[PDB]
Amino acid sequence: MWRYPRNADQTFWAFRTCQRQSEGAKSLREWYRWNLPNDEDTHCYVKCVWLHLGLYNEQNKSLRVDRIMEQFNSRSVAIPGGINTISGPTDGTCKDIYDKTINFFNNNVNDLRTAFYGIKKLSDEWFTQNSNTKPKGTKISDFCNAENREKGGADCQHACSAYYYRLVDEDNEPIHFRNLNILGITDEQFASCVKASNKQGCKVADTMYNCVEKHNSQALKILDNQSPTY
Ligand SMILES: COCCOCCOCCOc1ccc(C(C)(C)CC(C)(C)C)cc1
């Protein structure tokens, strides 16, 4: 189950993972400077980030306005105006989710960057003060191989890596929406790993890790290779 508020590693992962999933986009460079142009790839990049932050409810096709507000409150940032526009059901398209949130973004850019650690100084401070989280610049394998993290406090073998690959969340619950298609894992294959993982504790993480590796032996190696900055 997802935890809120989202921390600086969790927000960083959502941005970078969604950037990788749209890496051929014409507007990629604009996203780097916090500009979200009105084009299809940007629409779907925006939907991806809302989803990967844990802020899109796929069941009612609505933003988790309650958790968005919690992020502001937890970060001591004033609640922005215009919340009504981002609230309520969408039709599920990238276009609709973009249209419902673009003014909210454009009208509150720097407060949103503050609340979601989108400022280098604020992110650097979070990581400095949370040394038990994988630092930027360090690979998942190198971090999780240290301090017996892969054991998960028990007898596991991939407890830490499965978390940082986002196969499972902090609760060792599988992350159902994870997209590893470009790594050679189809949606059906990933779903089968989720289903294979009534297991309990970090055994869910190990089951997800082993199942993914079984489908494609390189996929998790690629995520590890990408992991210094995701
Ligand atoms: C290599 O370094 C790349 C760093 O880029 C990280 C910043 O990502 C770019 C910003 O992109 C977005 C994506 C989504 C959003 C939304 C609209 C979803 C708002 C948000 C993040 C405040 C919830 C805003 C900016």
Author numbering: 0 to 196, 198 to 230
What do the authors report?
In this study we demonstrate, using binding studies and bioassays, that the sand fly long-form D7s do in fact bind both cysteinyl leukotrienes and thromboxanes, and thereby serve as anti-inflammatory and anti-hemostatic agents in both sandflies and mosquitoes. Consistent with these structural observations, the sand fly proteins were found to perform the same anti-inflammatory and anti-platelet functions as their mosquito counterparts through the binding of cysteinyl leukotrienes and TXA2 in the N-terminal domain, but do not bind biogenic amines, as this function is performed by the yellow proteins.
The structure of ABI15936 was determined using single anomalous diffraction methods with a selenomethionine-substituted variant protein prepared in E. coli. The model was then completed by iterative cycles of rebuilding and refinement. As suggested by sequence comparisons, the protein is made up of two linked odorant binding protein (OBP) domains with a well-ordered domain interface fixing their relative orientations. The binding pocket of ABI15936 is much like that of the mosquito long-form D7 proteins, with numerous residues important for ligand binding being conserved. In the structure of ABI15936, Tyr 44 is oriented identically to the homologous residue Tyr 52 in AnStD7L1 and can be assumed to play the same role in binding.
